[PDB]
Amino acid sequence: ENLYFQSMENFNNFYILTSKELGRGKFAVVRQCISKSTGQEYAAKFLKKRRRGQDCRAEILHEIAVLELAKSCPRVINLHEVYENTSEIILILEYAAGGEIFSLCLPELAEMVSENDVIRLIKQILEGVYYLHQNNIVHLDLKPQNILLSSIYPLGDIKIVDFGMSRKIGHACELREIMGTPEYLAPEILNYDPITTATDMWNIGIIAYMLLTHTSPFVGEDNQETYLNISQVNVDYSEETFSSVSQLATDFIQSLLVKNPEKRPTAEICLSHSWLQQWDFENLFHPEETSS
Numbered sequence: 001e002n003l004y005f006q007s008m009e010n011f012n013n014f015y016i017l018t019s020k021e022l023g024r025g026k027f028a029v030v031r032q033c034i035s036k037s038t039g040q041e042y043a044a045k046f047l048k049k050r051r052r053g054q055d056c057r058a059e060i061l062h063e064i065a066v067l068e069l070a071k072s073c074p075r076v077i078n079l080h081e082v083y084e085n086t087s088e089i090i091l092i093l094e095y096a097a098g099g100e101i102f103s104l105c106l107p108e109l110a111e112m113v114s115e116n117d118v119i120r121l122i123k124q125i126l127e128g129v130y131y132l133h134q135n136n137i138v139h140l141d142l143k144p145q146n147i148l149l150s151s152i153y154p155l156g157d158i159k160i161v162d163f164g165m166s167r168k169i170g171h172a173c174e175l176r177e178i179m180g181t182p183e184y185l186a187p188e189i190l191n192y193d194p195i196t197t198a199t200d201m202w203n204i205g206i207i208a209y210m211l212l213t214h215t216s217p218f219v220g221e222d223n224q225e226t227y228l229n230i231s232q233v234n235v236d237y238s239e240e241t242f243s244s245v246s247q248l249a250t251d252f253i254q255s256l257l258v259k260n261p262e263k264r265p266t267a268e269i270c271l272s273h274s275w276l277q278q279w280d281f282e283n284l285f286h287p288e289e290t291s292s
């Protein structure tokens with residue numbers, strides 16, 4: 001195999017890895033790096049070209065092609081550079097210093113996140129997913145671990161990451177598809193129904209539910225119970241779980257967590273939801289009744 005991307009010798013001339021390991025999966029590791037020339041921080045993602053006995057360089061090229069298309073969208077993590085060695089393709093990504101939005105979904109941080117914050121983060125996620133869907137990209141892995149923040153103190157802006165599972169509308173629900181984290185899989189995936197933009201909208205429903213309740217809508221004692229919860233759309237909307245959650249947020253979640261993907265609103269329709277309509281109080285409102 002000949003290498004396509006910039007050499008490893010150039011990587012090590014231009015960047016130094018730091019002792020901050022950001023992430024590790026079976027066939028990928030993310031490590032913080034610093035430009036030796038500017039001191040700017042980046043995330044270096046090391047993708048193995050050989051996985052499960054399969055040559056994956058074509059799939060990695062398709063993933064880079066999707067990041068490259070979304071680089072005008074500030075809700076999507078930006079790709080800076082690409083390097084390659086014998087076993088890895090290395091993505092130099094924008095560093096999202098706040099880490100995962102998942103942290104905001106733990107009971108511990110609940111008291112540090114307002115309704116205002118949750119409304120803004122969901123609006124920013126919808127802006128990203130709107131942009132992807134207008135370009136016929138379905139992300140298909142929008143778990144809260146795949147939405148990052150530019151900062152937590154104070155609360156910054158969202159960055160969608162990890163286009164490993166992304167496809168076009170109408171692609172087959174193959175073996176890769178049906179191997180997400182069980183609790184985050186849409187009902188149409190459990191039924192090997194075809195890929196829809198509606199699958200991402202299901203996941204935005206889950207993210208809102210988790211930010212607002214600090215609980216998982218679908219997870220059970222075991223995968224069997226998780227799969228029953230999803231396939232039956234068995235969701236806890238109890239007075240105890242929702243005592244401090246507004247009706248408008250409940251409406252937003254309930255419009256997305258529906259079994260039939262065709263009944264879920266689009267990203268565009270979600271951006272017009274009454275829950276997300278808020279006036280910045282520091283701006284001067286111009287009413288319908290003019291002074292003239």
Ligand SMILES: O=C(O)CSc1ncnc2cc(-c3cc4ccccc4s3)sc12
Nearest residue numbers: 022030043093094095096097099161162
């Ligand atoms: O998985 C991927 O496809 C890319 S992951 C990634 N990309 C860009 N910037 C950051 C910052 C991270 C952070 C993770 C983490 C964990 C603890 C404290 C701070 C942080 S900041 S992960 C990441």
